[PDB]
Design a binder for this molecule. Structure first.
Ligand SMILES: Nc1ncnc2c1ncn2[C@H]1C[C@H](O)[C@@H](COP(=O)(O)OP(=O)(O)OP(=O)(O)O)O1
Ligand SMILES: Nc1ncnc2c1ncn2[C@H]1C[C@H](O)[C@@H](COP(=O)(O)OP(=O)(O)OP(=O)(O)O)O1
Ligand SMILES: Nc1ncnc2c1ncn2[C@H]1C[C@H](O)[C@@H](COP(=O)(O)OP(=O)(O)OP(=O)(O)O)O1
Ligand SMILES: Nc1ncnc2c1ncn2[C@H]1C[C@H](O)[C@@H](COP(=O)(O)OP(=O)(O)OP(=O)(O)O)O1
Ligand SMILES: [Mg+2]
Ligand SMILES: [Zn+2]
Ligand SMILES: [Zn+2]
Ligand SMILES: [Zn+2]
Lengths: 481, 481, 481, 481
């Protein structure tokens, strides 16, 4: 069979090898048509209707581009078409574990529904990949195209999830180390996955992207670093790399962590939690699963998509009333009310196990103001957001290797002070958003008082609108004035 | 409650008047989030994931822009903000009647499922608008903002569907005739609906748009034409108008009538037909409706979206197997095979009552060829496509009024001969596509022989691949040599 | 000496081989930075400030892209590194013969200044290329990078200008005929030169076209046609090809032949004609040349760019007063006034021999109206423009070869009747613009009367604004209603 | 007479009031067509051929957009069409004082040619505006459109250059203070000039823009701040503001201060210095001026554009030989060699009085390497570049006023700590680039040794490629290891 050409609004005309086509045309891959890339973000940015499917095509394409470029500039690397196909397949299949509304599912729902389990999106992708391969007879097509299914399937999985557990990989040896930096870069976070979603999300959101992946590809080489051949960027391109991470941060501030988008993800998750006992998804054998248990059976998970939303919204069963009602309130735009935003000060970090107690803290605050209404713990929502450069408190550029034009095969390192003094001094912070479920004027007022008092007691930052929303609280706070 | 700003990737930041927001935040309008603008086109162009929702937003916005422009350039027209709001509401609500997969529903499915009924997309939009209004207490909100519900609701409906069936409109008199030309121009098809979907579809498909609606708006005026005030374009802009329709035609040939997109629409429709007896959609009172009859109850139709596709796909009920299988074959990319394309010659038009007889005609033919495998009528699909400039055989530019720079309040007409000799000689044609449901090598060979013989017998145009797919048949037709 | 990466707003990051860089960094090439691509068009479209330099880079690049794609899809063509470099150089240098204001120079100025000489842009490019090579010691660099200067220099020139005097080319044999279809396609006009200026001019003008060269490249193959290996397009891409020419026509209608742009080209050409005796350009040995004779010495022509405009504009010598004044009137925007536009009918063409005589005719007509101030022939300008599909009366798609997917190695032909009846029936037409050098109210009125009467007498098309500018004249002609 | 529509690739179709058209169609304004926006940058980014003309149109337009938007949103500000016209004219004319290659002229050339005179670009623009007005009879045209020349010309000048001397402005009273923040914001640098060149320069450079000015305009209001009426942004837009300045910094890093671009500006400046004694520009009365003295006579400065470059390049006079040689060395791409880049450490700032002594410091350094060639001070170039957020050491966002959704007319302040911990800690830094005029391998090696030795001695930052370009020097510095 022959190659297919496909037209993508981001990358243009992409060539798809017949093996890739065989992989794409399976229920396991096509399911990605029914999962929105940005989930609840679509309910704030109406252009964001794009799905995981097209993004996956993009990542496969981009993975291919990088490996190809590397190969043509450096034939001594012995990059084979087999290598190219494996990196392409890895890029294509990286997101196969996506659940309903993408990262709402693994980031919000599963942690609340199944706290005992260790679930990652990537593990999901490996399992779903295995299921695709075994359910569609892919191994003989792989062999037909020069792949060796054992090592190569191992390699693809390793590209997606990391080492399956000092060279920890089995799919490829150290002299092909660079191949593991293409799809998901565990070392510094610089990969083609990011490059695709920056561009694609920007295209759909109506926000413009300022990162040029093509330039990066032009300037990329492979050099020896610690007895492995790794990808190195050109030294003077370091500025661009800092900008890339800045871009990432910007996209999170403007879109991915938009206050309303997040509150909508929250409400939908609440609906799924109230629906979990009663929704049935039929997997292997005819066995029944729940939304929270579909992850245990790939045939059921294959059928778990954004559809569940609509299944709940359109239901007539009384047992789903509660869930249904919540979704209906989303349609009427009767959302939880944003009360405010604050940050911790000094060294103070908030841990996830402390998240659960935060609404209790806010309601327990004691403002010295006349309050019509007393508010409870369940009236508040506290969303904690980690904003960083992808490596917690670390500078990812400290984990990038560079080359100089005068000696292109010699890897070097570049420190932050060698670049600019206008760069961040810290690379991680927390944003605390507080919302109130009671929508009346007085409850909202009260909630503002509770919130600002709470910020004052914990020495958090002064809310930007503090002097307007709670003028009796902010002045009696040494700093904030 | 204040105005909202929304960020659209096509138009940028749009202001939404609180009345519009009240209309948008209803189940009848939010419903459009679950219907793909281009339906089956998404299975060919992976960027085409956009839904009717954002498009309706865009059209409302642009209607607003045009009316506002007309108003600020010519205050003597007495355009009120009430007029602006009514025009905006009409733009927002024109597609309220969209069914699953947009024009697949009213264009393919409903005509086959219920041939006796006269259902149009627009009338559907009117009924759904009425339903939204009554189910959400909009009338007093309209009144709150200076609208007069009887006249204005009548006006909005008239803008969507035309005269509800001597000046035929009741919502506005002849001296505001131009207002009826903004949302859906029944006279020549030049309206803001088209502008939005050209721009938007081009953005998602990965095809670049070459029509400049902002320029058109800049050059628009209103002049007296036969005792009504109508929209007139600048004379010198006539070329652009021809180009617009050319653009329209291009999009239809590149995207909207794509051979695979159409066969996918055909298969989906076939599945919906096979599922029709068994799917239940709960409408008013709790009464059950089917996919083909949901159009009889707006409460039921509200819940009729692209979701059914998945409901059929995810089903386990044996009664749905047939339907299900069809959808599954789409997932495996086992589509009916494109055999070829031809056109009629001379004066010959194919009428709709004769569509049904075309596969039998193809199935008949005597290719005088080595007869491999015999094929039956039910093995063929024949799709007839009417390609025109929107007014059947008529030139729409003959129904446009122009003004010249030396006398901008004086309307004139421009004939085709006054423009260019490189323009089309005909403004309507028919396209005949033939596919075969038997997908094997020999069946395909056979189908090609039957098809070319059929083209020869009907004196149709010679297929482009004719000399290759049927080399024993093409020489027997002098005209083709 | 390594490759350089250069960033182009149209094509992105382009790689330039050291040989190409050596060619670029010469006075003969850098000269193209000082010559505007669209000449007078910048005085109508303020974004059109781009120069021939960047465009030449673009064409070199695209030429390379096409030949590389062909090579990798079909290794049996034996396309060498040398072939790629020669085609790139051809693209790079196809415009070396550009004169001040580009096509104003060879299209308007030289024919008026020296009607006896045979000057073309292409021959100018061959001459300038020879000069660049010889003045900068390029030949040994060519051999240093694997080129064979005699054969390859011949090949490059042939790519630019066509056969230097049956297989007429000496640079490459018939089995590489396809290489001659890349930079300048004399057979059908489909080349990378067009692709680049379509994209670039659109980028700068602020108008967009819908032609996708990248898609074309994806679908291009080389097949056998008449003992030649020629480039063939995929059959179903024929529509796009027709569209490509539509695009061309549109760009000419909107931008390249803009009425005001053309009148500015006319005025600048007049200033240059009036300046020719007095501007001195120093050529070889120190010999002096004029603007019209610099083409006789490449050392002088090297210094002949748009700069001359400013020299004339900034001059103080009385011998240049006339030239200067004209340019000054351009700065004050006192341009000749457009009076109107009309066309001839079907089978009769106006050939160059009559252009000179057209103003006398207009002034000669006797419009039965009160006109106080009579105009002479010298008060008029008549610009007639040939609009075609690039091959006079011919359909260029009749000269395109195609292949179908069932047999990609077999070239076939496709007729207009096989594609659509919505296409043009004719492929060439003439446009007549009339201007008046007298700019006062009464002179303008008079001019309108004369012009419309002239249209009436000659049975040309009715001017679009005819009933407005000459309401006393149009009633004498029944056909015009 | 009437308005003109003009098509700009950045802003689309702009309307120009007849007064603006009158101002534009003068030699003083049209002059801007012959001065490149980015000067020497065109010799690095080939798309950057745009001139000051189109940019000035853009700023006029945007100024109009902002004042207009403020006007419809808050009629209580009493913004008149007279105010709108005056702001448009100021935007239109802010750059009239541009010299050849824009900021090369006022930034490099004039300080070297005439260090005694105090010339700014802005004062230049004011003088040139006065000249335009007086030489073209603009005043009665101003009066014709409702403007009052005495007050209004003053207003325009004040908008460009600031107070010509409580409330320091005379053109408009304090209740129109916000009008002075539109074209050139002397308070915090947030103005429409920046918005336009960010967008335009990005469009031409092939760099993508990340700032959304339209969104800013939607969220802009006027509020009372410290007994003055100022433009305030919505609180939540604070992030966008920080990003805006980041964007600015990025544009300076990638394009405006590109090392090769700067060295090309440097060489051009030297050529102008060697040409100054010999080039003649004819000013008022017939008096002769130099490149360096043309600023003393507006009639002469009108004729001072990028043309001088070509005059020098095309000259034959022996007295200009040296100058000529320099330009020729640019054409052959024989440029001064970039040696390296470094920064001071800690609190150490380099003072401007010390710039001249730096090449001497570098040449005086004694690297312990065996050198063939010794270099002198005149062989080195040391470029010190101030990179900041537009207000030297200050955070400009500390000089921005914000408003909250709950009380849109109550201005507030927002501190850096209320926004993010990932923001710059410093807002100003110094960049030191070193180049060598000797271009042979050995001199370049030597220059590198001298340079890195100098960096070590001054305790500057370690050059990024230090260990590669100078491996015998870097180990001597503990701080660098
Ligand atoms: N004229 C066009 N311009 C831009 N994109 C197009 C055009 N036509 C189709 N596309 C898109 C749709 C697909 O995503 C991709 C490939 O389409 P296409 O070439 O029509 O494949 P196809 O499979 O239907 O034809 P075939 O099987 O005969 O090769 O490009
Ligand atoms: N920084 C941004 N840049 C571009 N678009 C944005 C940005 N932030 C949000 N958007 C989009 C999302 C929405 O479509 C639109 C409005 O967003 P936003 O201003 O955040 O409204 P909001 O309703 O959440 O805030 P508020 O109610 O306080 O005014 O702009
Ligand atoms: N950060 C950037 N982003 C986009 N384009 C850039 C950037 N920096 C430079 N450019 C452009 C300018 C040129 O057209 C092209 C090449 O520039 P550049 O990489 O700086 O080459 P260079 O010759 O100055 O460096 P070097 O010789 O050290 O390799 O890219
Ligand atoms: N069809 C077009 N599409 C886009 N831009 C155009 C088109 N035609 C012209 N332009 C540009 C060029 C100018 O910048 C601007 C105005 O052009 P145009 O409307 O033709 O002015 P004009 O002065 O020649 O006509 P007139 O004086 O008769 O109204 O738009
Ligand atoms: Mg809001
Ligand atoms: Zn991903
Ligand atoms: Zn529509
Ligand atoms: Zn060209």
């Amino acid at each position: 069979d022959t190659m297919k050409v496909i037209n993508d609004p981001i990358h243009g005309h992409i060539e798809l090898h017949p093996l890739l086509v065989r992989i794409i045309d399976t229920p396991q891959f096509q399911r990605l048509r029914y999962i929105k890339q940005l989930g609840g973000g679509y309910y704030v940015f109406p252009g964001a209707s794009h799905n995981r499917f097209e993004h996956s095509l993009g990542v496969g394409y981009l993975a291919g581009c990088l490996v190809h470029a590397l190969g043509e500039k450096q034939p001594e690397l012995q990059i084979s078409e087999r290598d190219v196909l494996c990196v392409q397949i890895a890029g294509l299949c990286h997101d196969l574990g996506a659940g309903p509304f993408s990262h709402m599912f693994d980031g919000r729902f599963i942690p609340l529904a199944r706290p005992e389990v260790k679930w990652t999106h990537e593990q999901g992708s490996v399992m779903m990949f295995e299921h695709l391969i075994n359910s569609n007879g892919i191994k003989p097509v792989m062999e037909q195209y020069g792949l060796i299914p054992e090592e190569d399937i191992c390699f693809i999985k390793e590209q997606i999830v990391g080492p399956l557990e000092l060279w920890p990989y089995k799919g490829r040896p150290e002299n092909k180390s660079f191949l593991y930096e293409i799809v998901s870069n565990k070392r510094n976070g610089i990969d083609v996955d990011k490059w695709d979603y920056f561009a694609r999300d920007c295209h759909h959101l109506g926000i413009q992207n300022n990162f040029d992946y093509k330039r990066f590809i032009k300037f990329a080489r492979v050099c020896e670093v610690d007895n492995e051949l790794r990808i190195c960027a050109r030294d003077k391109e370091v500025g661009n790399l800092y900008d890339m991470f800045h871009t990432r941060n910007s996209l999170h501030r403007r879109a991915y962590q938009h206050k309303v988008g997040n509150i909508i993800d929250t409400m939908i998750t609440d609906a799924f939690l109230k629906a979990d006992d009663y929704i049935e998804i039929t997997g292997a054998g005819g066995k029944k699963y729940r939304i929270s248990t579909a992850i245990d059976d790939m045939e059921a998970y294959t059928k778990l998509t954004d559809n569940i939303f609509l299944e709940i919204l359109y239901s007539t069963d009384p047992k789903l009333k509660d869930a249904r009602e919540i979704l209906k309130q989303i349609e009427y735009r009767n959302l939880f009310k944003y009360v405010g935003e604050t940050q911790p000060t000094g060294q103070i970090k908030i841990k996830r196990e402390d998240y659960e107690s935060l609404p209790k803290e806010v309601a327990s605050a004691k403002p010295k103001v006349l309050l019509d209404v007393k508010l409870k713990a369940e009236d508040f929502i506290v969303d904690v957001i980690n904003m960083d450069y992808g490596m917690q408190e670390k500078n990812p550029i400290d984990h990038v290797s560079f080359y100089c034009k005068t000696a292109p095969n010699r890897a070097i390192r570049i420190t932050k002070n060698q670049v600019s003094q206008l760069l961040p001094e810290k690379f991680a912070e927390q944003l605390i958003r507080v919302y109130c479920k009671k929508v009346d004027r007085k409850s909202l007022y009260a909630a503002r008082q509770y919130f600002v008092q709470w910020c004052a007691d914990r020495n958090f930052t002064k809310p930007q609108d503090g002097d307007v929303i709670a003028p009796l609280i902010t002045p009696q706070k040494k700093e904030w004035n």
